[PDB]
């Protein structure tokens, strides 16, 4: 129904996969 | 004569026994009706809950 | 002390109803209500699985390296958008065996943060910086349905389906951590019990919702279709 | 002296009765009676399943697809406007195998927020016109009976079937959350027990009107056309 | 405070005997005695099933759309007034199967607020605005027997069979909610126990009343009538 | 009058009125 | 023994089918 | 004549018995549906939980 | 609005963003 | 030839 | 033709 093309904006405060406060910068860069 | 009658009686007995066993009535409690599931007679989907 | 309206619709009014339902309200306390709500929502979404927090999305397989999205918590039905086909999940060893030993069924596994597939799938999706362009999804486009981690409140105007569907749940699960912050045990136990009861009611509703339109009776399926 | 009427049938009288059975007359408590009633109604309807809160609606199948209404809690018997042909729920892994390996039974599933029928049935909606004219139901229609969720009161004169059937239910279940707000344990226990007993009586009443008036023996013989 | 006569025959004297048997009588209390009696009668009729609250009436089938009357709570024997015939209730799926696959037996189900019948029944009844006119019930006139919801008291002179048969039941079931209105638990428990005992006695009487004129022994019924 | 007899009377119902659908028909 | 031809006068204070305080007006109209 | 009829009845009985036994309906509780797993009829992967 | 209805809405996710590997690719 | 149950 | 998962 949708695609995952948007940009990173937050971190996974709940969830064992994804980004963290120490890694979101890498996603954004 | 008697023999005939006798046999009939015996036969009758046998018959009625079968004439009941073929009905296959099921005994059940109150909190397990689930009419939608029970009345539905298909090979799979029955609910013998509770 | 603070006031509140009948419906607890938003974060702004929830953080005040929390301090209301607990007379333990002051400077050193209200400032951490956000942390209590954070802990409560984390404790909730850690095991809560319901539709309103689900999310469907297309994937890009690239025959292997396909990666798990960040919001992945639990996978629902997985299929395509062409004639329909449901995948089944297996272990890494099964796929490693399939690779050498050898296309109606399609399997997949979870290698760390990837989703592996035995066949060389070539699913296509638009690249990242694409502007709009729904792209009219092409063929061989798999559609994944999973449970996504909801967002954390960051503004008083920020609302969520949980507030409009069951605010007492959040209120109790956060009064738990509040009464823990201060020294209190009876309130902790009571609020925990009430929150657990509400969550049990909600999950039982979800259960009675699925497969709830007719009975079931397996029609002795013995693969009528064998010729192919 | 907050005075309520004998036939409790509205939201305002219910609010006044809640404030009465909890004699405390204070703004800190009265201003939250709406929140308590909200919690109570959200606790009841979340798992209550009875006829009066059901609803019938025609679907708008385009091509073996659909969309669930925003007021959907649980679905029961579905069929067409003609000949019956009750549908039976299945799973995705089966309604997707039928297409590959497949007088004509019907099956439907739930793909998140979309009912998916295998045979690719077609449905149509009735005539919309509001000019005091009948809906004129449409041919090739499909009927669905679900347990609709009721709307929030948000008004004094508003009412519901519960206020007329079991106002004590909502009264006790909201006094429960009230006596939770204020630290009152024995009251919580009493009100919860009473509400549970009332709900048990209601669900038992809904069971004694089911397919009861007949023997449970002689299992049916819906075998086939082949005798 | 108030007085009362030996027999509690009507609502007017019951609402005073309630305040008598509970010294907790005053302005703020007597005004709600009607509400307590309403709650008690609701708790009673919710599960009480006995003859005196039954009701027989003809129906209008119209081959399908036939609707359930408002006072429907539970259906007793259902039949016709011509040569006798008893219907049996089945599920929607059975009727949907009967429709296509295919008249001694007659079944019926409950589709929401309707009573469906597989055969195209043509039962007839006089229309709504008909004045009197018993109509000499025509043929094909089904007669339904069910349990109807009794009326709520609205006048002091209004009486009911419950008052003339068992007033202590109502008095106890309403003193329950009275002692709940005020803060009291021992009285609540005692009155609840006594009311439950009275109701158990009444339902046991109803049970011992049915099929209570002779023993039973199934005479090996194996459908002696098969020729037809 | 009946003392405990259940057949000694029969309390009426709410009202012998049909549904809105029957009136519309 | 009787017919259900009388007019609506009250609501089902007990009973899961029928009318309500918010629907009796429709029956009467 | 009677014999014929009689036999038919007996036969009918037998038949209907089988005509039910072949359905193979399964009784189950409420907290063990797992529709995804149950409906899936494959040699391996079933979930008889609870 | 929905009162207890679960289909009456659907709360968004954290963000529909991919991993660093997809951006690198 | 069967319709739905509209509100009163 | 499969690589490891490096850090972000």
From TrEMBL, chains B, H:
It comes from the Viruses. This is Portal protein. It comes from Escherichia phage vB_EcoP_SU10.
TrEMBL record, chains C, E:
It holds the Pfam family SU10_adaptor. It comes from the Viruses. InterPro entries: SU10_adaptor (IPR056209). This is Uncharacterized protein. It comes from Escherichia phage vB_EcoP_SU10.
TrEMBL record, chains F, I:
This is Putative tail fiber.
């Amino acid at each position: 129904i949708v695609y995952n093309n948007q940009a990173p904006d937050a971190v996974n405060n709940v969830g064992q996969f994804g980004a963290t406060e120490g890694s979101i910068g890498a996603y954004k860069q | 004569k008697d023999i005939q009658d006798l046999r009939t009686a015996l036969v009758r007995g046998y018959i009625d026994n079968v004439n009941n066993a073929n009905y296959g009535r099921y005994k059940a409690l109150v909190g397990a009706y689930d009419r939608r599931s029970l009345l539905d007679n298909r090979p799979g989907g029955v609910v013998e809950m509770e | 002390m603070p006031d509140v309206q009948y419906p607890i619709n938003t974060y702004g009014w929830l953080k005040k109803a929390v301090a209301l339902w607990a007379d333990r309200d002051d400077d050193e306390f209200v400032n951490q209500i956000p942390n209590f709500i954070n802990f409560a929502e984390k404790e909730i979404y850690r095991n809560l699985r319901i539709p309103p927090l689900e999310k469907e999305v297309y994937l890009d397989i690239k025959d292997g390296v396909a990666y798990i999205p960040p919001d992945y918590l639990e996978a629902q039905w997985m299929m395509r958008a062409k004639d329909g086909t449901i995948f089944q999940v297996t272990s890494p060893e099964e796929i490693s065996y399939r690779r050498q030993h050898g296309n109606q069924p399609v399997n997949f596994a979870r290698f760390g943060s990837r989703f592996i597939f035995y066949p060389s799938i070539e699913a296509d999706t638009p690249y990242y910086p694409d502007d709009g362009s729904p792209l009219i999804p092409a063929e061989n486009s798999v559609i994944l349905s999973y449970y996504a981690d909801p967002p954390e409140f960051h503004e008083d105007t920020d609302t969520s389906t949980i507030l409009t569907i069951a605010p007492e749940l959040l209120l109790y699960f956060t009064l738990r951590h509040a009464c823990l912050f201060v020294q209190d045990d009876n309130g902790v136990q009571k609020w925990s019990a009430l929150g657990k009861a509400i969550l049990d009611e909600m999950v039982e509703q979800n259960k009675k919702q699925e497969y709830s339109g007719s009975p079931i009776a397996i029609p002795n399926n013995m693969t009528r279709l064998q010729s192919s």
